[PDB]
Symmetry: C3
Subunit: 253 residues, 3 copies
């Protein structure tokens, strides 16, 4: 039996035929689970929530809860995600998007917290006890090391990196490496660029870009103007320029 007889499946929950649900797990009202998803034992799923295909949800996780902070609120999870033990994921709020969104191929490790209205892209890694306070946007390939704490409304750029125990209060531009409490910009995620097979011309253009923004005494407005030529030439320097441009809380330094 794919659905263990000790599991609780709410009559309003919609499941694909091959979904697996472990013992003592609760698939609450308005939960939707897609093809090939494996729900481990002792899992609490609450809705309105959509869980896509080939996901893996480990024991003691509480996914789709109401934020502790009849309003129609939602949580949407994509495909091929791994949600480890004790992870807490809250649904969105009417006083925003009404949605917490998680894309594809993400790895959300033990006791990580995804606050209401957060948006996670694809291929992200949120290491043990990473906490997103709420309204946090995490772009593609970002890595947040163990116990990274993220202030509300913060944007974590594409391929960015945070060291363990970092406390992020400002936006992290794309590819930037950040460390400490409060978080400070240190360098670019060159190891990340190598894993993805970026060209030597692109890696050099990104190293040049970091210096314009952080190591040349330029203001945000001064740096953005100087980056315009490199961003037009390289689509990845454009990813860097855009994350600085769209920063609301200022950039991490």
């Amino acid at each position: 039996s794919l659905i263990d007889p000790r599991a609780i499946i709410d009559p309003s929950a919609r499941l694909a035929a091959d979904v697996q649900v472990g013992p003592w797990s609760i698939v609450g009202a308005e939960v939707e689970i897609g093809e090939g998803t494996v729900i481990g034992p002792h899992v609490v799923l609450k809705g309105p929530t959509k869980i896509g295909k080939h996901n893996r949800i480990y024991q003691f996780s509480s996914v789709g809860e109401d934020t502790p902070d009849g309003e129609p609120t939602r949580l949407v999870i994509g495909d091929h995600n791994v949600i480890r033990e004790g992870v807490t994921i809250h649904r969105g709020t009417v006083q925003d998007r009404a949605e917490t969104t998680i894309g594809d191929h993400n790895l959300i490790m033990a006791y990580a917290h995804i606050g209401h209205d957060s948006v996670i892209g694809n291929h992200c890694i949120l290491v043990n006890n990473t906490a997103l306070a709420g309204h946090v946007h995490v772009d593609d390939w970002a890595i947040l090391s163990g116990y990274t704490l993220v202030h509300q409304y913060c944007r974590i750029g594409a391929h960015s990196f945070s060291g363990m125990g970092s406390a992020i209060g400002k936006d992290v531009p794309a590819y930037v490496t950040v460390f400490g409490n409060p978080a400070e910009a240190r360098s670019m995620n060159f190891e990340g660029m190598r894993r993805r097979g970026f060209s030597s011309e692109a890696i050099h253009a990104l190293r040049r870009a970091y210096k314009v923004v952080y190591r040349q005494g330029h203001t945000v407005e001064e740096a953005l103007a100087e980056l315009a030529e490199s961003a037009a030439q390289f689509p990845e320097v454009a990813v860097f320029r855009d994350s600085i441009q769209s920063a609301t809380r200022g950039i991490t330094r």
Copy 2:
């Protein structure tokens, strides 16, 4: 359908008010008392001697009323209208201290927060995710401890005080004071909280002056306490600030 789920384990000695709800696979241990309107979620472990009041809400994977990992009976007393989120750990007292861990009313204890043995939480406190109270910690009314605040043993957290995220508090936090970092450092006062509480402009103004007296005028704790005496008799809110510095045994956060 049934208020007490048939899959839950309820010890014969536990005392539950008629309308108490217990979710599936929860354990309500011996000598655990639960008051009217309380909702115990699924997968909850409740150990005693413990008294839980009225209209509380306890979420899944919480362990409430456990013995300390660090024999006369030791209690855990929880008040009314509290919210205890998932994976919260609350230990009972130790006979060598007060033999009781106490939590008042209208508290919000968020996911994975830890309340060490012999800790006392007042009313209307917010303990954000993973806040940890090492033991013998006193948290006075309306305190806000942001995500992952670590509080050293025997520390006192003043009324209406605030800690920033990831704060590591080794010293007493006076009432109203905002603390940040590891190690925690005093920054200002939570004037925002005062206004939400309906404090008068005059009370707020006297507290602002009280902060300056303690932290920005080079006074010793003794000189500061004598200078605050006058304003403290005029305003009960300044007497609260002055009393928290007077009661400091680990010194104040600077």
Copy 3:
């Protein structure tokens, strides 16, 4: 009052000593071996290949013996070995090793692993250690005997935590911690030595005196690690405790916490 609760799941490949206690809604997975006098609480997940020794106590919501989620691991027959008289509190996560290292996570005897602590792949814990609430060992972390890691201590991969060392609450350890050294903050900084622990253990005043002197040689006299190790050589020959300290600086591959 059956020792194995009827609501618990015992895989038929699991090997248990006859007096093993297993609480309701606990899972004793495939290839899990449990020794005499061990008590498994309710709501515990045990996965293998795992050996759990004698007189252990494993609390509710713990996940012991899982695979590391780390992208480098690929379903290998890796192990977790836990010794005797250990206490694993509620919500603790312990992962098995990886073939890329020595394919084993090892925990010795008389350890206290407090609530929500994390023991990453290929970590080695000795004896009489205390890992306070939410301490996290990223992976390949070696914790020698009698170390105390205070609440929310974070340890970088491959770090070595020396015997009788101490970390303050919220420490972020990125380099090796020599034996007896006390470290605080993010990033961790060396402060002094755990003289309190040395006294509790019954070290002679002569040994304590020579350890205090050894700390100054390494940290307070502006010497290099090579110079410091040559200067400590004779004190190390007369005091096993100084040899323990000297060895921890010798074996440091990530540099020592300064």
